């Protein structure tokens, strides 16, 4: 029996688009019926690859990889935006967290997760790109920020670029979305001094 995504794409469903709440990710499926979103504009890396890997799964599950009210004490997690509105009210992805400054500081961020699900874990995150350097300071305070995501099989360092861009859905900023598969027993480590759209919920699954 297939996975019914209704009016949402894989991106909107996997990212947790607020308009895909009632969608339910059943424990296993053979294929995905779809209607091809990302309410915050940006680039979803290896999107077609992900659609292929999620094409048929067993033992699928959505779990809380970094609890919102514990994992980030020294950062603000309540960031919402009108680009991802729900019920005429600004909101944000249900599987991600927009980390911003708290009390005028954005302390160096470091958090890690060990895969104890005995299955493959799909982790997704984002990198946010303001359009001017003043706002970069206001939101994250460091001018030359970095984001680092490392596992035993994945390693990448993201540098945000500050550029004036045309408005998309009324937004001049951008959030690029990335993902990786975490093998059982492996550890993934997130490090940043800004611009990290942190994983809030993640997914554990057996492929095929």
């Amino acid at each position, epitope marked *: 029996a297939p996975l019914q995504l209704g009016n949402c794409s894989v991106a909107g469903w996997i990212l947790g688009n607020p308009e895909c709440e009632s969608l339910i990710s059943k424990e296993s499926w053979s294929y995905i019926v779809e209607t091809p979103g990302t309410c915050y504009p940006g680039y979803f890396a290896d999107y077609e690859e992900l659609r292929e890997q999620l094409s048929s799964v067993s033992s699928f599950e959505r779990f809380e990889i970094f609890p919102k009210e514990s994992s980030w004490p020294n950062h603000t997690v*309540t*960031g*919402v*935006t*009108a680009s991802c509105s729900h019920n005429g009210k*600004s909101s944000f992805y249900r599987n991600l967290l*927009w980390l*911003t*400054e708290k*009390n*005028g500081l954005y302390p160096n961020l470091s958090n890690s997760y060990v895969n104890n699900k005995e299955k493959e874990v799909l982790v997704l995150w984002g990198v*946010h*790109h*303001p*359009s*001017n350097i*003043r*706002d970069q300071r*206001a*939101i994250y305070h460091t001018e030359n920020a970095y984001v680092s995501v490392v596992s035993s099989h994945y390693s990448r360092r993201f540098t945000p670029e500050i550029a004036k861009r045309p*408005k998309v859905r*009324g*937004q*001049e*900023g*951008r959030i690029n979305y990335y993902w990786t598969l975490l093998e059982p027993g492996d550890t993934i480590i997130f490090e940043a001094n800004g611009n990290l759209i942190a994983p809030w919920y993640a997914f554990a699954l057996s492929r095929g």
Partner: antibody
Amino acid sequence: QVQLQESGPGLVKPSGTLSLTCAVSGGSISSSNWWSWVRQPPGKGLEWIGEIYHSGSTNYNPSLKSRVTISVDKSKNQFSLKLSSVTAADTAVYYCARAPPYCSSTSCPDDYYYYYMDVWGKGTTVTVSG
Amino acid sequence: SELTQDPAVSVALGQTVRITCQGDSLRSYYASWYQQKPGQAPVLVIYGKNNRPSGIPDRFSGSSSGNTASLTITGAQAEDEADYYCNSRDSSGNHPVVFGGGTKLTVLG
């Protein structure tokens, strides 16, 4: 529970310089806030004077720019206001207040598109007279 | 630019009144509202949109549409008789802060 309190002379001679200091307590000025000054002439509305960041960068009312100076002093947890060449038009109740951070572009969360002054000083009356 | 609001309006005891604030600056920044009584400092009643500070009664609500922000008072009480200023940040230049002229609210009855 930040609280503000103005202080300074209640009388300033014409062509003189008004000097007020706002004492900040219950919190640190080193923060993400815009420490602001507001005034209200007798029987008139509110007029924004200027704001200052703890770094020392300032943003002033254009109509008062060439007479206004707003300073910050982290040694005493205070910020101050100086207004030169005062006339009868500068007689007013002066308030110091606290504003939140903001963004100039549409690339920030909604919290950075508010403007308000939530905490206010009790206000101190300044009258310009000989 | 500037924020323009009616300088005076009346409302009967227990009725509902909507005070309007207009200005192109409201297209990119949220409008806050203050209540002021003679001899007292302004008191913030709306942070922006429809968020009230702690201690502000529920009958003070905020809405907006276009370049117009509105403060609605449902069931006006005697103590609501005061001046109401709208306030936002200019969207041009160095973004100076702008105040509305204020609205003097008379509570009849």
